[PDB]
Specification:
It is classed as viral protein. 9% of the residues lie in helices and 32% in strands. The chain has helices at 23-26, 57-69, 207-210, 225-228, 310-314; strands spanning 2-3, 10-12, 31-32, 41-42, 48-51, 77-79, 84-85, 100-102, 107-112, 120-123, 126-129, 143-145, 156-158, 168-181, 191-195, 214-217, 230-234, 237-241, 252-256, 261-263, 270-272, 283-292, 299-302, 322-325. The radius of gyration is 20 Å and the shape is globular.
Length: 326
């Protein structure tokens, strides 16, 4: 007998007590080494009701990473509301690392073995673990990076498809590489997003299938820049790649443009960071997940959305839930 209770979690990662990475410095300040000998137990004939949207593990990690950025990525001017603060703004290395989240002394986590889990509901094959797997803190909009591929057919997940206002998260059964560069030699704020087109006319051809009326794709309706485009951080620079060519009626490239005036995803307010450093700034990370929205005719319209950042973690913590072992 058990019960779905909530408590204070803790992180576990292959942190390093020397490196100058933003993560590898904080992820060793309030985090622990990854437990070398894992222990999973395959529960037979066991079913449990998971949920990713009303989950707390999401809100746990979401808050822990906001703290990370509010004490690492220091903006030259942090502006929120009336009051204002302006401090130092140096450039540091920036590459996300595996952050296993583990359960404290007295509790446990359940890892749904069922690969085709709908994100919210019963799990046919349930197992249990002590900690999560290698989870890289990917902060972005429209697209998800460096994540984990879906083992089975393309999986869709929603909180309430009754409402078209609730975001939709997608996983994939094969990865597609993205390449956003910044030539190391005029105009600094300019970038190029490269994608193998042949591996794209497949990985979206397959998507609209599981999506099955008729399917139509378009660019974001209209919101803040960070949402209506692809916002992500590369070595410390906030890239913004125009996703217009992807959603039209090979070797697909995109006109990305580095900014400094970002609209903070943490809460409210904007921030200005120091201009990009000279040199080829090309971050290469895999594509694993997608965030969209539904428009509320014979067609159904789907627009990419960055909305709340909590979904970006909800795509990696969906098959987990906290329980107090009786």
């Amino acid at each position: 007998v058990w019960k779905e209770a909530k408590t204070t979690l803790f992180c576990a990662s292959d942190a390093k007590s020397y490196e100058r990475e933003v993560h590898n410095v904080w992820a060793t300040h309030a985090c622990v080494p990854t437990d070398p000998d894992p222990q999973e137990l395959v529960m037979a004939n066991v079913t449990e009701n998971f949920n990713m949207w009303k989950n707390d593990m999401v809100d746990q990690m979401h808050e822990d990473i906001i703290s990370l950025w509010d004490q690492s990525l220091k903006p030259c001017v942090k502006l929120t509301g009336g009051s204002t603060i302006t401090q130092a703004c140096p450039k540091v290395s920036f590459d996300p690392i595996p952050i296993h989240y583990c359960a404290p002394a007295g509790y446990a986590i359940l890892k749904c073995n069922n690969k085709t889990f709908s994100g919210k509901g019963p799990c046919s094959n349930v197992s249990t673990v002590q900690c999560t797997h290698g989870i890289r803190p990917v902060v972005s909009t429209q697209l998800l990076l460096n994540g984990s591929l879906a083992e089975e057919e393309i999986v869709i997940r929603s909180e309430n498809l009754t409402d078209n206002a609730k975001t939709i998260i997608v996983h994939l059964n094969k990865s597609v590489e993205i390449e956003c560069i910044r030539p190391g030699n005029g105009d600094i704020r300019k970038a190029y997003c490269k994608i193998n087109g042949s591996e794209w006319n497949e990985t979206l051809t397959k998507v609209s299938e599981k999506l099955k009326k008729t399917i139509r794709f378009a660019q974001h309706s209209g919101g803040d820049l960070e949402v209506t485009t692809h916002s992500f951080n590369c070595r410390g620079e906030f890239f913004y790649c125009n996703t217009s060519e992807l959603f039209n009626s090979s070797n697909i490239t995109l006109p990305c443009r580095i900014k400094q005036i970002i609209n903070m995803w943490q809460g409210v307010g904007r921030a200005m960071y120091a201009p990009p450093i000279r040199g080829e700034i090309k971050c290469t990370s895999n594509i694993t997940g997608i965030l969209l929205t539904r428009d509320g005719s014979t067609e159904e319209i789907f627009r990419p959305e960055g909305g709340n950042m909590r979904d970006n973690w909800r795509s990696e913590l969906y098959k987990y839930k906290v329980v107090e072992i009786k």
